Amino acid sequence: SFQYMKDLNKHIPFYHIEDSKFKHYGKVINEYDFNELETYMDSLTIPQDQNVYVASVTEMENTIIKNQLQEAFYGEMSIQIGYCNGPNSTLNGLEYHKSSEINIAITDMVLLLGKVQEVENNVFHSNDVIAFFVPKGTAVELYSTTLHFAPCKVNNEGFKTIVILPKGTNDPLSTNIQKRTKEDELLFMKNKWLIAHPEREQLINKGAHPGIKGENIKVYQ
Amino acid sequence: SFQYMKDLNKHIPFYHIEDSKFKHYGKVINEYDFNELETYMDSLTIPQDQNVYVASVTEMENTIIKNQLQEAFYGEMSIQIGYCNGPNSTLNGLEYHKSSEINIAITDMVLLLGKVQEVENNVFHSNDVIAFFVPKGTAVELYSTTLHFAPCKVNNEGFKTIVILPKGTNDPLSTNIQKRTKEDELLFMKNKWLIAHPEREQLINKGAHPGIKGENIKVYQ
Ligand SMILES: [Fe+3]
Ligand SMILES: [Fe+3]
């Protein structure tokens, strides 16, 4: 429940995804159903140790709805459908893509969002983050200029999310560039620029840029 | 010259592209060399009747700069390089992509920009447009949430721009979708959503949505 989560998280701006404060970050998508996907997602368990992210799942890609979303929402550009399920409750990191991402909440979840415009010399401040409570069943477009990461759990068992992007996004980089722009320092996976919190050893050890300044926010439930 | 243009366009909030007001719309790209493309552009004159947009030019794509922009600025996503040159001086339309576009000003030019978030039931108002004077040699990223169209001229002979996007963008739609979202009404080419001004009969005739309210803004020079 939203009010329970709201009450417990007075240390961060906290909104329902249907609130107009979301409008700068994304849009709620209403006119699609996702039965084919939900059927797949129900065959999956939530890991309790750490989040899993599969970028591209054939089963979910071989669907009517994938073809609908590709031709219309993505204007005929090739897409992948994956999932991010897990027990996480902290910010950890903030990433962007030069694309639209769809997140479909298969469980209640929360997203910690920023705006890429608020990055200055590869630094973003926790204070700028906003949380949005997304109910089971809700689908959102997150804009390319919206800093985002893995959801934070609402229910004790964790969360389940469908994640839709241009095909190839989050694949390993296949070249090692000559870095020349500020942004190049963030480049981490295909079509994925990442700003990690310095207390997130799992990302820092992977080479991620340590540019979140402030507390690694925690979402209490 | 910027002050010349500014003095003639007091009917429109008018800014240098280096101004901070641009930060909401895009970013200036500095650390790249576009010389190979500049050389191709020198082989062209400016059309005098009407704009020309060619989405993909193989010769421009078979360059070192194309490989660099693909691997780094687009994070390994496949890109096309084209150009948009001509004599235009009006708004005419506002389009977006679920991608970043790069515009490289080979001549002085002006961009009339909006935000996608300012669209309300498939309507944008001219009064929300902001003009940005882009000097010869400036490269800009336009974010996916930035409504944009073809440049407006500074010099009497017209303008020349390089246009970089994900490969396929602005190709003809291969499907006729069953429309279901407000956004589906705007879908006009591959990865291109357009809101046309009603005075451009040629766009409306082709099925563009007439949703710009207000003057077809003109840039005087
Ligand atoms: Fe993402
Ligand atoms: Fe465009």
Residue numbers in the entry:
A (entry chain B), B (entry chain A): 3 to 223
What are the paper's exact sentences on this?
Bacillus megaterium encodes a functional sulfo-SFT pathway and the corresponding gene cluster contains a DUF4867 family member, SqvB, with 51% sequence identity with E. rectale SftX. B. megaterium SqvB adopts an α/β fold with a central, characteristic β-barrel and belongs to the cupin superfamily (cupin from latin cupa, a barrel). Determination of the molecular weight of the predominant protein species in solution using size exclusion chromatography-multi angle laser light scattering (SEC-MALLS) revealed that SqvB exists as a homodimer in solution. The role of DUF4867 family members in the sulfo-SFT pathway has not been determined.
We speculated that the E. rectale or B. megaterium DUF4867 could play a role in anomerization of SQ or SF. Therefore, we soaked a crystal of SqvB with SF and could detect clear electron density for a ligand at the center of the cupin barrel. The metal (Fe) was modeled at the active center bound to the same amino acid residues as before, namely His150 (Nε2 at 2.0 Å), His99 (Nε2 at 2.1 Å), Glu103 at 2.0 Å, and Glu97 (1.9 Å). We observed that the water molecules bound at the metal center previously observed in the native structure were clearly displaced, the omit map (generated after modeling in the metal and solute) showing the additional, clear density of a ligand bound to the metal. However, we were unable to unambiguously model either SF or HEPES buffer (used in the crystal growth conditions) and the structure was deposited without modeling a sulfonate ligand. We therefore also examined whether SQ or SF could bind BmSqvD using nanoDSF but did not observe any change in melting temperature with 10 mM of either ligand.
